Structure 1
Amino acid sequence: FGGSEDTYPYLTGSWSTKFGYPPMPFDGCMFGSRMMTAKEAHTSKQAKQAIVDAPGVDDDQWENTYKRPTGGVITVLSEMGEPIHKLATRGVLFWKELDDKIFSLDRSKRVAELKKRRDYIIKKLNDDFQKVWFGRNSAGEPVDLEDMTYAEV
């Protein structure tokens, strides 16, 4: 929901009629994703910006989150493994990435697979993720933590 025009139906019990059912009135409506752009909310400017910019999708193809960047949101897994809906930013994309190739593998086999895609994951880490690769050197380029000088660290 994001307005009273779509809210109204369920608020009345009219939605349920569309399904060959009597009216089933809801005692109220609840707003979450909607209010994120309230100026009195703490969402960073460009954040609530990029939020608006999400082309929504209808109750039709929300199931599509699970597979594609559908609208502006995509589904991705927590560290707990639980499913989450997020704005499919470059980060949240490369996050879905590791979900499928790194966090998909059992603990053991993981570390090995990391070393193989190391400098790849390290680029995508440096380039478009919330947390960067701590590996910079004096000159500016990225290196191994084990290769940095004390100063540099």
Structure 2
Amino acid sequence: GTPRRAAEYLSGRWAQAYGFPLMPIDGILVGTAAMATKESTTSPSVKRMLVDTQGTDQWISAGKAQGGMASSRSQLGADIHEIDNSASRCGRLLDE
């Protein structure tokens, strides 16, 4: 998320929470934080909802929703993450 978190994964300072030495890495890839950019072509209402939502740090069990987000099933049965809205309610209803 935040560039502070990007720096603490890049510097290897993240391992002291587990009690290891510095384990640095050399690149981090950013997918979701670029969804609300200028050149991206989502809808502006989707950009507004994506700003206004806020997501948890813990796990979300399958078929439930905790704090803005949700995790549900897919066409083949695989797991996906969704924003908890009228798509996700219908998605977990059809999952049931």
TM-score by length of 2: 0.89
Decide whether the 8 Å contact of 1:65 with 1:73 is kept in 2. Answer: no
Residue 65 of structure 1: how far off its partner (Å): 4.8
Decide whether the 8 Å contact of 1:53 with 1:72 is kept in 2. Answer: no
**Structure 1 residues 65, 48: closer, same or farther in 2, change over 3 A?**
farther
Find the counterpart in structure 2 of residue 147 from structure 1.
Answer: none
Q: Tell which structure's C-alpha radius of gyration is larger.
A: 1
State the aligned residue count: 96
Residue 67 of structure 1: how far off its partner (Å): 4.7
Aligned-partner Cα distance in 2 for 1:65–1:33: 21
Point out which structure has higher relative CO (alpha carbons under 8 A, 6+ apart). Answer: 2
Find the counterpart in structure 1 of residue 36 from structure 2.
Answer: 37
Aligned-partner Cα distance in 2 for 1:33–1:57: 15
User: What's the % identity of the aligned pairs?
Assistant: 31
By percentage of residues, which structure has more helix? 1
Residue 35 of structure 1: how far off its partner (Å): 0.6
Deviating 4+ runs (over 2 angstroms): 64-68
Q: Which runs of 5+ in 2 are unaligned?
A: none
**Structure 1 residues 46, 76: closer, same or farther in 2, change over 3 A?**
same
Find the counterpart in structure 2 of residue 93 from structure 1.
Answer: 89
Decide whether the 8 Å contact of 2:63 with 2:72 is kept in 1. Answer: no
Decide whether the 8 Å contact of 2:63 with 2:92 is kept in 1. Answer: no
Find the counterpart in structure 2 of residue 71 from structure 1.
Answer: 67
**What does 1:94-133 correspond to in 2, within 5 Å?**
94-100=90-96
Find the counterpart in structure 1 of residue 5 from structure 2.
Answer: 6
Q: SS of the residue aligned with 1:5?
A: helix
C-alpha RMSD of matched pairs (Å): 1.4
Aligned-partner Cα distance in 2 for 1:76–1:11: 31
TM-score by length of 1: 0.58
Find the counterpart in structure 2 of residue 151 from structure 1.
Answer: none
**Structure 1 residues 81, 67: closer, same or farther in 2, change over 3 A?**
closer
Find the counterpart in structure 2 of residue 137 from structure 1.
Answer: none
